[PDB]
Amino acid sequence: FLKNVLEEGSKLEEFLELSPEDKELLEYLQQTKAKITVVGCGGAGNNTITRLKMEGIEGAKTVAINTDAQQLIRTKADKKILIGKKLTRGLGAGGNPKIGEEAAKESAEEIKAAIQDSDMVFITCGLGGGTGTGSAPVVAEISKKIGALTVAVVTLPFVMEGKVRMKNAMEGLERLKQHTDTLVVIPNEKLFEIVPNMPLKLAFKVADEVLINAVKGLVELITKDGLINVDFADVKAVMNNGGLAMIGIGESDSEKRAKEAVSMALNSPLLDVDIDGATGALIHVMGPEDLTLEEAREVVATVSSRLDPNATIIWGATIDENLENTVRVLLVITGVQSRIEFTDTGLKRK
């Protein structure tokens, strides 16, 4: 009986030590925990969720929504939602964000049901298409309505995708910034400065890799046990009014991993903005089984001296089973909307 399940599962929890006070407390933490849901919209959104799912994202429910049934069936997630079951019949919205938006609206109640009791929701997707670009802002609007920390981690299209797609992305990015607490944007075009002679046929595979790493890094920073205390109250603090944000990723293998990883992360072409005054930042330093709090401490210090002396900085350090002799640093600087300008050919640096 599935219905008994939830109730008999507590029997084991409750039933050999603690006192009555600790009895209530322990039984309290059970519920108190922060519920995280990541929602992937459209093509790139769905490829990301599948990996997060298959690789096992820690402490977060995965939701994949799509207007296209073919894509949705190949996707793996804790929950899948075919938005626009009446508007599209599960055939795809094409490159028209207006359809994807309407598709999401149509399934709004279904979406709300998938993120219902979430303390924080991550909306991820690749802008430029019709589904992700159209639905993402609706999922964000619904997220805020249920009262969850609403963060979005999205990518801007490659220039080789065309002005129509970029323009649609920027407009989507605009509508999105309206319903998010913090909006993280990844310019795919810069993916070319990290891998200059990267084969065009691989651009998207790499884009998938970066988004997955970014969403996973941010999410796990909050949920995965590490060498140090990462409190949800702080995340709430930094993410809550983080306007526009960008990321930087780096890693090193040399006997100056931490130091060299920060360098890459800070000089990352993905950080297409002046960060020398940032008011907030989330840092996640991942490494091998030999990772010391000292290295993580060295990364944070490095970054801290670039931001505002008053900058709010959340950081963590987790150990990744299969991580070489390499330490990877995911950097997320917030409140940089005033250093950028929204145009329809991409974001421009002020």
Domains in the chain, CATH or no CATH each: 1-33 (1.10.287.1110), 34-243 (3.40.50.1440), 244-350 (3.30.1330.20)
Kindly report the number of other CB atoms within 10 A of residue 141's CB atom.
20
- Tell me: is residue 59 an annotated ligand-binding position: no
Q: After which residues is the chain broken (C to N over 2.5 A)?
A: 15
Resolution (A): 2.7
- Tell me: is residue 42 an annotated ligand-binding position: no
For tokens 């990290």, what's the residue?
A: 194
Residue 32, classified by CB atoms within 10 Å of its CB into exposed (0-12), middle (13-18) or buried (19+), is exposed
> Which of 57-80 are b and which e, b meaning 16 or more Cβ less than 10 Å from the residue's Cβ?
beebbbbbbbbbbebbeebebbbb
| 94/332 Cα distance (integer angstroms) | 32
What's the distance, Cα to Cα, between the start and end of the chain in Å? 61
Cα–Cα separations (whole angstroms), residue 122 to 52, 136, 154: 12, 10, 10
- Tell me: is residue 95 an annotated ligand-binding position: yes
| 47/56 Cα distance (integer angstroms) | 14
Sign of the dihedral defined by the CA atoms of residues 125, 128, 129, 131, in that order: positive
Residue 176 exposure: Cα atoms within 13 Å on the Cβ side: 35
- Tell me: is residue 44 an annotated ligand-binding position: yes
User: What's the DSSP call for residue 36?
Assistant: E
User: What's the DSSP call for residue 160?
Assistant: G
Strands, E, within 233-345: which ranges?
A: 244-252, 280-287, 312-319, 327-334, 340-343
3-state helix, strand, coil in the chain (%, to 5): 45, 25, 30
Of 214, 212, 158, the C-alpha closest to 187 is: 158
- Tell me: is residue 43 an annotated ligand-binding position: yes
Sign of the dihedral defined by the CA atoms of residues 190, 194, 199, 205, in that order: negative
Residue 323, classified by CB atoms within 10 Å of its CB into exposed (0-12), middle (13-18) or buried (19+), is middle
- Tell me: is residue 217 an annotated ligand-binding position: no
Of 110, 109, 140, the C-alpha closest to 45 is: 140
User: What's the DSSP call for residue 33?
Assistant: S
- Tell me: is residue 132 an annotated ligand-binding position: yes
Which secondary structure element, helix H or strand E, spans residue 316, and what is its range? strand 312-319
| 55/11 Cα distance (integer angstroms) | 30
